[PDB]
Amino acid sequence: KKLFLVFWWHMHQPLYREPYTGEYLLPWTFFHAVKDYYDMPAYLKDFEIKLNFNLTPVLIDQIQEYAQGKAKDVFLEAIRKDPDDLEKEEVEKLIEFTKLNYEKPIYRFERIRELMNKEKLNREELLDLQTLNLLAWCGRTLRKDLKDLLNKGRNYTQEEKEYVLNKYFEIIKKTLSIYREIKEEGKGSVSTSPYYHPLIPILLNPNCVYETTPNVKIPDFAVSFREDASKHVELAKEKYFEIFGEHPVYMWPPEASVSNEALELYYEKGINMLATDEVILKNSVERASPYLRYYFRELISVFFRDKTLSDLIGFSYHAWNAEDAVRDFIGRLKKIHESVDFQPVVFVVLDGENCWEYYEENGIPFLEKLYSTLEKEEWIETLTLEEAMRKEDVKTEVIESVKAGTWFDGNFLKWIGNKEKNEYWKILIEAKKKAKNDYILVAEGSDWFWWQGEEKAPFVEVFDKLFRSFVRRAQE
Numbered sequence: 001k002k003l004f005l006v007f008w009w010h011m012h013q014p015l016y017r018e019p020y021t022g023e024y025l026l027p028w029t030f031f032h033a034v035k036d037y038y039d040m041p042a043y044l045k046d047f048e049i050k051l052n053f054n055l056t057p058v059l060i061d062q063i064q065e066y067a068q069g070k071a072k073d074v075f076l077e078a079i080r081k082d083p084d085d086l087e088k089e090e091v092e093k094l095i096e097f098t099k100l101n102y103e104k105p106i107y108r109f110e111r112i113r114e115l116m117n118k119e120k121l122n123r124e125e126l127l128d129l130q131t132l133n134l135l136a137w138c139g140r141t142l143r144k145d146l147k148d149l150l151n152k153g154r155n156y157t158q159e160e161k162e163y164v165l166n167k168y169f170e171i172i173k174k175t176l177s178i179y180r181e182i183k184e185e186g187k188g189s190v191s192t193s194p195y196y197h198p199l200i201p202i203l204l205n206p207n208c209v210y211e212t213t214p215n216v217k218i219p220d221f222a223v224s225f226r227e228d229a230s231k232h233v234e235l236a237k238e239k240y241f242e243i244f245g246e247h248p249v250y251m252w253p254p255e256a257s258v259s260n261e262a263l264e265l266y267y268e269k270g271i272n273m274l275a276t277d278e279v280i281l282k283n284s285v286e287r288a289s290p291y292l293r294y295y296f297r298e299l300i301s302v303f304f305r306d307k308t309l310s311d312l313i314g315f316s317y318h319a320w321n322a323e324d325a326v327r328d329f330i331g332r333l334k335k336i337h338e339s340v341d342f343q344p345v346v347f348v349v350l351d352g353e354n355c356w357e358y359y360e361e362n363g364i365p366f367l368e369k370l371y372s373t374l375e376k377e378e379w380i381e382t383l384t385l386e387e388a389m390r391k392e393d394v395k396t397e398v399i400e401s402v403k404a405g406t407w408f409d410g411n412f413l414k415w416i417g418n419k420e421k422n423e424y425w426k427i428l429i430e431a432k433k434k435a436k437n438d439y440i441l442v443a444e445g446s447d448w449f450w451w452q453g454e455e456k457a458p459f460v461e462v463f464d465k466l467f468r469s470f471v472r473r474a475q476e
């Protein structure tokens, strides 16, 4: 009797490329590429387990632009320059960026503490500020290769900074290749999402928000987004085809969002399996275990992720010591294993790049211990998405209807329903009336609405600038 374990790491960035200047207005794609997008599948070189990945098409587009040397990244330019060449505005961006990231464990360099304590920085001090911002995002592979420079922690030269930059771009250039390789070697499956990561159930039918939040106020959806919902899925299939040579059969629905209409669309588009969230399952059927493979109307296969295990990694374990965290997680798996006669399928699905910066040492002690432990547990079998989809010795059940929702509380309130988020939908609705090109699809991405009308929102003015630029470009 085995427990089947399925990791599915979701990787995504909205488009930071301003359409009129071509400049990347935030560096987050660059920094998550050098820290997470190569290194997460690269664990499979060292550990004999299966790990699965979702890559959104808009993320793939940007990785390609960086790897080709075409990304005009404004924050990265302030890092690369000799400090004597920095504009006053660029120094201010560097300090601002440091300040935002300052409390993250990956920024735990004594020299950063000293630099942010100085009234003004000379050329040598700015060289350190630039280089330590780069090194803070060093991924697992180069933390071993560049170990000597990392332990330096201060006194960086322009030549050392440029050397680190060159190694980082090497990592980016190898990123799509590592995904093809782990896919071809059978170490993992690779999925994609509708192209710009939109909320497909809202595009198909805005009134689906009233399935879970009857009191929410939404704007007048005076235009149809149904054809755009189809286009997101179709263009995603073409982009995945271009990278991997075949059409995708697995998709990750953005925000785990599903509805009856969305499931039908994925089915009509040839998708064979997706996953969603445990809260959706609980809202949709009275009694339902998440350890079964489900069949929606006998049209498409659905797994419901284990929300507890997924949230422990994604939100809890950064606050734990690495060994205790792994012991806790293995112990929960043991309880699941002992709780049923059949062989359960346990889906662990979460963002693949966002939690690690809050762990000690970028989550590397945690993940190395977790994977090293999992690979020697004889009663656990990690599975690719393809293996999970075809596994015969598993329990299954047919479901006829789901209640629309997302993995955030089972509902859509993080993207619609307050004044500021509703203003964005009205802008999109009015723009959709006059849209002339596919930049209207870019503005349909979920990220723009997520940051609107929120308290934190680092660089929300940049996201607002991007959203409104795409909305303006779509009408020309």
Ligand SMILES: OC[C@H]1O[C@H](O[C@H]2[C@H](O)[C@@H](O)[C@@H](O[C@H]3[C@H](O)[C@@H](O)[C@@H](O)O[C@@H]3CO)O[C@@H]2CO)[C@H](O)[C@@H](O)[C@@H]1O
Residues within 6 Å of the ligand: 010, 011, 012, 013, 014, 028, 032, 255, 351, 353, 354, 446, 447, 448, 450, 457, 458, 459
């Ligand atoms: O400056 C704000 C914020 O920007 C960057 O966050 C990006 C994430 O790194 C990226 O993964 C993506 O996050 C979305 C997930 O893919 C998605 O599944 C869901 O959880 O919502 C997220 C937001 O829409 O996009 C965001 C930007 O939208 C940067 O990395 C953060 O550090 C920074 O705080």
